[PDB]
């Protein structure tokens, strides 16, 4: 069957930049290629069909080209709302195939997180387990290190992170880290701290509490 | 106007069956092509099946040949996908989509429907407060299956500053996630903040007043 | 009318049927084309070639049934303008399938697969047109 080999699998460019995304078809599919954009947890929308026809209502910054079996989506003045994943498809032969996707991230200016920490509620502790949550709010770039410290003891293996998808207006990320303990262990100790490392902080920040 | 409304999704045991449904408005199934395309959580788009009633023409992906059947009731302007012998690899958001006919680009997709294939069983979630210039507060939504939950704040009245996080699969086998919002510090004590968790797979609706 | 003489008499004996047998040929060549699995680029070119040629022919035959009869008298009978329009559509599809690709993005047309099937059907309707 037909493969659509698409690259890069992800890229990061600034507002105003011209990005190029490529899709090679394993054999001629003529001009039956289409490009779709999909924002996170949404249905794809169509941008281009027949390789290079702009679909009605789509901003003309988006264009398509054919060269033999090489297809190119060009976004020629990247806007911050263009954060999405872009999929090429061929629909000439069957089955219909898609490329693995390009995940476009918008490069913006450095911004340090704001850091919050939250102790476990009474509610939860009255059930045998204690979750402590460290929040990093609205920052860029996405690289960030969170370490948990219990009474200066560096905590490994017992926390989990989740990052939001990149904002579509101001291009930032938020992140949570959850330390999870048994009521028993949470009672054994006093000082609960998360240290956050990031490029917009000139040295790591700690938020802590006691109890 | 063109709309495609999928329903029929949800949780189902391996070996089991489901029947997705797609309701069309703004064009006619009977002369158009309807497709079902799916997306395994975290992955790409896999085409699954198509029908162009006008030609008595349907078609299937190999991963699905034999187990799934696509069809249209041209008088309800609706399409269906019958899914039998579900396996775990079939877990996905299943999108209904249309094109003018079978050799024309797909030009519109529904928001899709979540099919989860698993032996494991619906558990609704526990909900805890993350109690608190600018101040941060939130809800920890914890120990639930399957995805997904639906947090809003003050019955969706509050949206600005709100971040709900991707659920995280705990090693237990259940999900938890948090939802946080940032608000002015002056408003704690005067303004009331509630988070409306909602887990349709369990008919669970929980509301936590969070406060200092 | 100065040339309409020598042409309109050349379009008989034996172009009457050769042209028709050439239509049968065309459909046959297509059925073989569609029946042979997995033919190479080179075999494909070869069969695409024969399809185009046979189409170029039908195209000339029609810049003669117009040069020879004259724009207005052929064109009066719109019945023949169907069979003429038909020729032209298929020639356009074939020229693109066999040679002018991969310039077709430039046409901005979509529905390429059904265009093709159409033009294949049209070749048959050509005999159907013939009483
Ligand atoms: C309006 C002009 C468009 C007519 C084009 C007809 C479709 C051309 C199909 C080309 C298929 C070529 N190939 C090598 C993939 O088989
Ligand atoms: Cl634009
Ligand atoms: Mg956001």
DSSP assignment of chain B equals --EEEEE--EEE-TT--EEEEEEEESS-GGGSEEEEEEE-TTS--EEEEEEEGGGTEEEE-TTTTTTEEEEEETTTTEEEEEE-S--GGG-EEEEEEEESSTTS-EEEE---EEEEE-SS--BPPEEEEE---EEEEEEEEEEEBSS----EETTTTB-TT-EEPPPEE-TTS-EEEEEEEEEEGGGBTTB-EEEEEEEGGGTEEEEEEE--
Interface membership of A49 toward B (CB under 8 Å): yes
The pair of structure tokens assigned to B103 is 């050799």
Give the C-alpha separation, C89 to C97, whole Å. Answer: 12
Interface membership of B102 toward C (CB under 8 Å): yes
> Could C102 and A66 be called an inter-chain contact, meaning their C-beta atoms sit closer than 8 Å?
yes
Residue A181 has a CB neighbour count (10 Å cut-off) of: 21
CB C99 near ligand 1, within 6 Å? no
Dihedral sign of CA atoms C78, C83, C84, C90 in order: positive
CA distances from A86 to A7, A41, C91 (A): 10, 14, 37
Q: Say if CB A35 and CB A48 are below 8 A apart.
A: yes
Place of tokens 């009066």: C76
Same domain, yes or no: A169 and A104 = no
Query: What are the start and end residues of each CATH 2.60.40.10 domain in chain B?
Result: 1-119, 120-211
| End-of-domain residue from the set A75, A108, A141 | A108
Interface membership of A26 toward C (CB under 8 Å): no
A139-A193-B168 Cα angle (round to 5)? 60
Bridge pairing between strands A4-7 and A19-25: antiparallel
> Could C113 and A92 be called an inter-chain contact, meaning their C-beta atoms sit closer than 8 Å?
yes
Interface membership of A63 toward C (CB under 8 Å): no
Strand partners, B80: B21, B71
Same domain, yes or no: A132 and A91 = no
> Could B131 and A121 be called an inter-chain contact, meaning their C-beta atoms sit closer than 8 Å?
yes
Domain around C98: 1-131
Nearest CA to ligand 1 atom 9: C97
Same domain, yes or no: A202 and A171 = yes
Ligand 1 atom at minimum distance from A30 CA? 15
CA distance B177 to chain A (A): 8
Q: Minimum-distance ligand to the CA of A63? A: 2
- Distance (angstroms) between ligand 2 centre and the Cα of A79 equals 8
Give the C-alpha separation, A206 to A145, whole Å. Answer: 12
Same domain, yes or no: A7 and A91 = yes
Same domain, yes or no: A123 and A88 = no
Interface membership of B28 toward A (CB under 8 Å): no
- Distance (angstroms) between ligand 1 centre and the Cα of A21 equals 24
Domain count of the fold of chain C: 1
Q: Say if CB B209 and CB B193 are below 8 A apart.
A: yes
Across A144-159, b (16+ Cβ under 10 Å) vs e yields bebbbbbeeeebeeeb
- Distance (angstroms) between ligand 3 centre and the Cα of B112 equals 21
Same domain, yes or no: A170 and A98 = no
B89 contact partners, CB below 8 Å, separation of at least 6: B40, B63, B117
The CATH code of domain B1-119 reads 2.60.40.10
The pair of structure tokens assigned to B92 is 């996905």
Chain B nearest-CA residue for C114: B103
Domain around A119: 109-211
Same domain, yes or no: A155 and A103 = no
- Distance (angstroms) between ligand 2 centre and the Cα of A61 equals 4
> Could C110 and B105 be called an inter-chain contact, meaning their C-beta atoms sit closer than 8 Å?
yes
| End-of-domain residue from the set A77, A108, A139 | A108
Query: CATH number, domain at A12?
Result: 2.60.40.10
Q: N- to C-terminal Cα distance for chain C? A: 29
Domain count of the fold of chain A: 2
CA distances from B176 to A123, A162, B168, B201 (A): 16, 10, 6, 15
The preferred substitution site among C52, C97, C105, C110 for testing ligand 1, maximizing ligand atoms within 8 Å of CB, is: C97
Give the C-alpha separation, A49 to A59, whole Å. Answer: 14
Ligand 1 atom at minimum distance from A92 CA? 15
Give the C-alpha separation, B162 to A102, whole Å. Answer: 27
Query: In chain C, which residues have their Cβ closer than 8 Å to the Cβ of B103?
Result: 110-115
Same domain, yes or no: A140 and A88 = no
Q: Say if CB A186 and CB A126 are below 8 A apart.
A: no
Interface partners of A (3+ CB pairs, < 8 Å)? B, C
Nearest CA to ligand 1 atom 12: C97
Nearest CA to ligand 1 atom 6: C93
Same domain, yes or no: A8 and A83 = yes
The pair of structure tokens assigned to C43 is 């075999």
**CA-based nearest residue to B74, from B94, B52, B58:** B52
Query: In chain C, which residues have their Cβ closer than 8 Å to the Cβ of A68?
Result: 102
Give the C-alpha separation, B94 to B112, whole Å. Answer: 5
- The domain covering B120-211 belongs, at the CATH homologous superfamily level, to Immunoglobulins (2.60.40.10)
Question: At what resolution in Å was this solved?
Answer: 2.8
- Distance (angstroms) between ligand 1 centre and the Cα of B122 equals 52
Query: In chain C, which residues have their Cβ closer than 8 Å to the Cβ of A49?
Result: 110
Give the C-alpha separation, C125 to C92, whole Å. Answer: 17
**CA-based nearest residue to B70, from B44, B43, B105, B102:** B102
CB C59 near ligand 1, within 6 Å? no
Same domain, yes or no: A87 and A177 = no
The preferred substitution site among C96, C107, C113 for testing ligand 1, maximizing ligand atoms within 8 Å of CB, is: C96
DSSP code for A113 = P
């Amino acid at each position: 069957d037909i493969q659509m080999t698409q690259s890069p699998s992800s890229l990061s460019a600034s507002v105003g930049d011209r990005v190029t995304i490529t899709c090679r078809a394993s054999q001629s599919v003529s001009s039956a290629v289409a490009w779709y954009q999909q924002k996170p947890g949404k249905a794809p929308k169509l941008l281009i069909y027949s390789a290079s026809s702009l679909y009605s209502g789509v901003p003309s910054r988006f264009s398509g080209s054919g060269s033999g079996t090489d297809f190119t989506l060009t976004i020629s003045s990247l806007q911050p709302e263009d954060f999405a994943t872009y999929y090429c498809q061929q629909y000439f032969y069957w089955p219909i195939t898609f490329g693995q996707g390009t995940k476009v991230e918008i490069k913006r200016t450095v911004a340090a997180p704001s850091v919050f920490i939250f102790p476990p509620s009474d509610e939860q502790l009255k059930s045998g387990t204690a979750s402590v949550v460290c929040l990093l709010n609205n920052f860029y770039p996405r690289e960030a290190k969170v370490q948990w410290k219990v009474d200066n003891a560096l905590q490994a293996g017992n926390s989990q992170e989740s990052v939001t998808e990149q904002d579509s207006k101001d291009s930032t990320y938020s992140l949570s880290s959850t330390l999870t303990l048994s009521k028993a262990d949470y009672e054994k100790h006093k000082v609960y701290a998360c240290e956050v490392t990031h490029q917009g902080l000139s040295s790591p920040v700690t938020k802590s509490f006691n109890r | 106007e063109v709309q495609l409304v999928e329903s029929g999704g949800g949780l189902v045991q391996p070996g089991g069956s489901l029947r997705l449904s797609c309701a069309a408005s703004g064009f006619n199934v009977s002369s158009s092509s309807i497709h079902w395309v799916r997306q395994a959580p975290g992955k790409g788009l896999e085409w699954v099946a198509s029908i162009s009633s006008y030609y008595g023409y349907t078609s299937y992906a190999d991963s699905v040949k034999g187990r799934f059947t696509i069809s249209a009731d041209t008088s309800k302007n609706t399409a269906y996908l019958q899914m039998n012998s579900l396996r775990a690899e079939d877990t996905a958001v299943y999108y209904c989509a249309r094109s003018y006919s079978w050799s024309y680009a797909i030009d519109y997709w529904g928001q899709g429907t979540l099919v989860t294939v698993s032996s494991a069983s619906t558990k609704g979630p526990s909900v805890f407060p993350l109690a608190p210039g600018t101040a941060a507060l939130g809800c920890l939504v914890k120990d639930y299956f399957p995805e997904p939950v639906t947090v809003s704040w003050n019955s969706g009245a509050l949206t600005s500053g709100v971040h709900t996080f991707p659920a995280v699969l705990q090693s237990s086998g259940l999900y938890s996630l948090s939802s946080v919002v940032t608000v002015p510090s002056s408003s704690l004590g005067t303004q009331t903040y509630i988070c409306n968790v909602n887990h349709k797979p369990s008919n669970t609706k929980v509301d936590k007043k969070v406060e200092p | 009318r100065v040339q309409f003489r020598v042409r309109a008499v050349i379009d008989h004996l034996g172009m009457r049927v050769f042209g028709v047998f050439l239509i049968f040929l065309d459909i046959i060549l297509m059925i073989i084309d569609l029946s042979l699995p997995g033919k190479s680029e080179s075999s494909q070119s070869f069969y695409d070639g024969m399809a185009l040629a046979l189409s170029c022919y039908f195209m000339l035959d029609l810049g003669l049934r117009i040069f020879a009869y004259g724009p207005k008298n052929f064109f009066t009978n719109p019945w023949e303008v169907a069979d003429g329009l038909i020729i032209v559509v298929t020639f356009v599809v074939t020229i693109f399938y066999t040679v002018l690709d991969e310039y077709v993005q430039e046409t901005g047309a979509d529905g390429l697969g059904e265009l093709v099937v159409l033009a294949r059907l049209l070749r048959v309707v050509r005999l159907a047109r013939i009483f």
